[PDB]
């Protein structure tokens, strides 16, 4: 059921009203650094890893050994990539 999402919408509306009241009451009286792109790339990869973990973590009780090892292989590929990142100096900001 999506019924519990309606209070969240009303909550957002009220929070926006409070923010506008607070911010509106006083009105009455050329350098590219590649390392930011790189940190974004790594964040994107590991964000997708957390995404694929949520269905797996709630489903471990039914997938048993097969699902565990399929996730392990997924992690293995992504960790080979991470090791490549480490060795190439992508994790060093010095």
């Amino acid at each position: 059921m999506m019924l519990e999402f309606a209070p969240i919408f009303i909550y957002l509306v009220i929070s926006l009203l409070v923010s506008l009241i607070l911010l509106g009451v006083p009105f009455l009286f050329s350098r590219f650094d590649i390392r930011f792109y790189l940190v974004s790339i790594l964040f994107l990869i590991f964000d997708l890893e957390v995404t694929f973990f949520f269905p797996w973590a709630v489903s471990l009780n039914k997938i048993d050994l097969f699902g565990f090892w399929s996730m392990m292989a997924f992690l293995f590929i992504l960790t080979i990539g991470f090791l490549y990142e480490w060795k190439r100096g992508a994790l060093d900001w010095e």
Binding site: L83, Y84, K87, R88
Partner: protein, 488 residues
């Protein structure tokens, strides 16, 4: 449980070997102890070994690839057709890699990750050939495309390489989105993505008045994506720019391997499927447009790489004529044409890579080559006459089937277009022979002799080109075998 994975021993091995090579390259390229050695050639040799071992594993275990077919059914489907297609793909990858060592050493391209990306794209094309569902097909296509986008921009400081990478990325992402839209439309209209389920639902009705417009447009958009992939007009303009701008080994790999993988995909998605002649008309009109545009644009070219690119566009048109006619002999001739074009293209790119040590850029740079290297000038001329389709060379089969299907399927406009385009192609191919043999330029260019790898590959391909028609039976029989494995 373990024995179920005998169906995927080749892919498991090649993926694991690629991981090993990645780790080896990264560990020793960063090493101060060994003075940060270039490892492109070391990793390249080890990867050629890995490709050959994968080919042995696939070729020897021919029946075992079909094991546990029910268990693997919803992921892929392996049969005779995929077996021979994958063997051909692995051989093409091995030859392309073998032609790269002089480029690594003399240019000093020290990036070993180039080899790793080639290996990963080879894994992707392997999965493309065995794909039997829209989801798997799309994912394998995308792995392949991402590897190609990265390697096309491998000379990251070059204006040409970066430009080619950018154009490639933008247009390829556009076409991939179009194809994905087609898949979504098909899924919504039929509630299925497996190729067998699609075969059952579509068979028997085609356009029977009450036609599912969703299925029609899904087929249309998927066909647009496929036509982009095979460089067919009017979804072709990326190919000449990308082919020219990429590093020459990248161009060599792109001109052969991805065609085999996507034609396997085309044959399994549509021939194995069922719809009206609409799709056959699509490929017919694209074939005619491709022959005309390829011929004229190749006639306009002054540079070798662009000429080869437009020649490839014309030849895919010739090949797609065989798909359009919708017969068993059509599929057989398509496979024969793909095989012969792959071998001829590898011959031509071995010659181009040999001449790139002296930075060959223009056709005029080949002046007086019959004097400065007579055997090489003859080898390139044999290839050019094979390209033009002159008998008894191997390139004559494509011309022969083009005209055979037309006078059988009843087409006469197609015969006229074939005649005119064949004559135009002969002109712009023999222009290269005239440049190497007839011209007497004031200034010559003396080319460095090629390495042993390219000479051996050139000798073997030249013998095949001159002599295939003397003993052509194995190719004919194996292509006929594959054509029937698709249906029965």
């Amino acid at each position: 449980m373990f024995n179920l994975f005998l169906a995927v021993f080749p892919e498991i091995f090649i993926i694991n070997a690629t991981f090993i090579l990645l780790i080896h390259g990264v560990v020793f390229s960063t090493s101060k102890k060994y003075d940060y050695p270039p490892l492109a050639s070391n990793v390249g040799w080890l990867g050629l070994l890995s490709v050959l071992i994968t080919l042995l594993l696939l070729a020897a275990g021919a029946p075992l690839l079909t094991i546990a077919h029910l268990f693997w059914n919803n992921l892929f489907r392996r049969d005779n057709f995929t077996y021979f297609c994958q063997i051909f793909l692995l051989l093409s990858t091995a030859g392309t890699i073998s032609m790269c060592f002089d480029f690594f050493d003399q240019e000093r391209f020290d990036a070993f990750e180039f080899i790793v990306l080639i290996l990963l794209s080879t894994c992707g094309m392997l999965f493309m050939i065995s794909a039997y569902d829209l989801i798997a097909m799309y994912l394998a296509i995308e792995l392949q495309s991402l590897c190609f986008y990265v390697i096309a921009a491998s000379k990251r400081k070059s204006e040409f390489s970066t430009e080619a990478g950018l154009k490639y990325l933008i247009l390829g992402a556009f076409s991939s989105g179009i194809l994905l839209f087609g898949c979504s439309m098909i899924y919504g209209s039929t509630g299925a993505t497996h190729f067998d389920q699609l075969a059952k639902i579509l068979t028997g009705y085609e356009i029977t008045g009450a036609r599912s417009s969703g299925i029609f447009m899904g087929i249309l958009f998927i066909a647009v994506g496929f036509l982009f992939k095979i460089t067919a007009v009017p979804f072709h303009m990326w190919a000449p720019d990308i082919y020219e701008g990429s590093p020459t080994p990248v161009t060599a790999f792109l001109s052969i391997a991805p065609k085999i993988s996507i034609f396997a995909n085309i044959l399994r998605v549509f021939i194995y499927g069922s719809y009206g002649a609409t799709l056959q008309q699509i490929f017919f009109f694209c074939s005619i447009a491709s022959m005309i545009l390829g011929a004229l644009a190749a006639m306009a070219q002054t540079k070798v790489k662009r000429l080869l690119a437009y020649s490839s566009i014309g030849h895919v048109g010739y090949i797609c004529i065989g798909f359009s006619c919708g017969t068993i002999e059509g599929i057989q001739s398509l496979l024969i044409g793909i095989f012969i074009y792959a071998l001829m293209t590898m011959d031509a790119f071995a010659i181009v890579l040999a001449l790139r040590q002296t930075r060959v850029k223009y056709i005029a740079d080949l002046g007086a080559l019959a004097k400065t290297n007579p055997i090489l000038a003859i080898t390139f001329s044999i290839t050019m006459f094979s390209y033009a389709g002159i008998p008894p060379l191997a390139g004559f089969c494509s011309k022969f089937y083009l005209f055979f299907a037309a006078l059988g399927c009843g087409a006469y406009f197609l015969a006229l277009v074939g005649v005119v385009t064949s004559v135009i192609g002969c002109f712009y191919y023999i222009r290269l022979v005239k440049r190497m043999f007839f011209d007497t330029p004031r200034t010559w260019i003396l080319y460095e002799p090629m390495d042993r790898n390219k000479s051996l590959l050139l000798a073997m391909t030249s013998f095949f080109i001159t002599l295939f028609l003397l003993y052509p039976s194995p190719l004919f029989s194996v292509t006929h075998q594959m054509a029937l494995s698709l249906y029965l």
